[PDB]
């Protein structure tokens, strides 16, 4: 798709057998989603840093369908205020900024 | 341009007679830049909210050249950790997400 930016770029994602809403966020390095069950080995990761850090669980090689397009990559799971699709997965789906 | 997202989307901007670096940030509603002198009437604005608020100065109808393309819009000036080009100005330059 081509997505304009008058509104927050919220899209439907499919992940872990669930549907969720998430923000396409070019200002975020990583993808971080609300609590949910994902397969595989995870390890804790400290993210943020500006004001403090937040602990999340890092899951690698997770399949996601972001607005119809499939990708595999790292998904952090933990207490984020908004579900964020970060650059790691935006690149995997071939999402670019254009003007 | 077409900008991929392997790296942070930092671009050169021209504003207020100066050159600066800023991030093209689809996860930010507003444009917020480090301390600098801008023309016109400003008013304080509280931004953020997640953990607390930060006070910035709101300047309207400021001309900016974002990676070669001119736009006019609102620029918030204050103590941001990164210079951010938010959706308000991304829309003005016709920046879209595409995949
Ligand atoms: Mg951000």
From TrEMBL, chains A, B:
<dbReference type="InterPro" id="IPR018061">
    <property type="entry name" value="Retropepsins"/>
</dbReference>
<feature type="domain" description="Peptidase A2">
    <location>
        <begin position="20"/>
        <end position="89"/>
    </location>
</feature>
<dbReference type="GO" id="GO:0072494">
    <property type="term" value="C:host multivesicular body"/>
</dbReference>
<dbReference type="GO" id="GO:0006508">
    <property type="term" value="P:proteolysis"/>
</dbReference>
<protein>
    <submittedName>
        <fullName>Protease</fullName>
    </submittedName>
</protein>
<keyword id="KW-0064">Aspartyl protease</keyword>
<dbReference type="InterPro" id="IPR034170">
    <property type="entry name" value="Retropepsin-like_cat_dom"/>
</dbReference>
<dbReference type="InterPro" id="IPR001995">
    <property type="entry name" value="Peptidase_A2_cat"/>
</dbReference>
<keyword id="KW-1039">Host endosome</keyword>
<dbReference type="InterPro" id="IPR001969">
    <property type="entry name" value="Aspartic_peptidase_AS"/>
</dbReference>
<dbReference type="GO" id="GO:0004190">
    <property type="term" value="F:aspartic-type endopeptidase activity"/>
</dbReference>
<dbReference type="InterPro" id="IPR021109">
    <property type="entry name" value="Peptidase_aspartic_dom_sf"/>
</dbReference>
<keyword id="KW-0645">Protease</keyword>
<keyword id="KW-0378">Hydrolase</keyword>
<dbReference type="GO" id="GO:0055036">
    <property type="term" value="C:virion membrane"/>
</dbReference>
<dbReference type="Pfam" id="PF00077">
    <property type="entry name" value="RVP"/>
</dbReference>
């Amino acid at each position: 798709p081509q997505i304009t930016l008058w509104k927050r770029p919220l899209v439907t994602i499919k992940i872990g057998g669930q549907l969720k809403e998430a923000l396409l966020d070019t200002g975020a390095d990583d993808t971080v989603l609300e609590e949910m069950n994902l397969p595989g080995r995870w390890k804790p990761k400290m993210i943020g840093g500006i004001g403090g850090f937040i602990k999340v669980r890092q899951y690698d090689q997770i399949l996601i369908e972001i607005c119809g397009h499939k990708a595999i990559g790292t998904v952090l799971v933990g207490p984020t205020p908004v579900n964020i699709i970060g650059r790691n997965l935006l690149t995997q789906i071939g999402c670019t900024l254009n003007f």
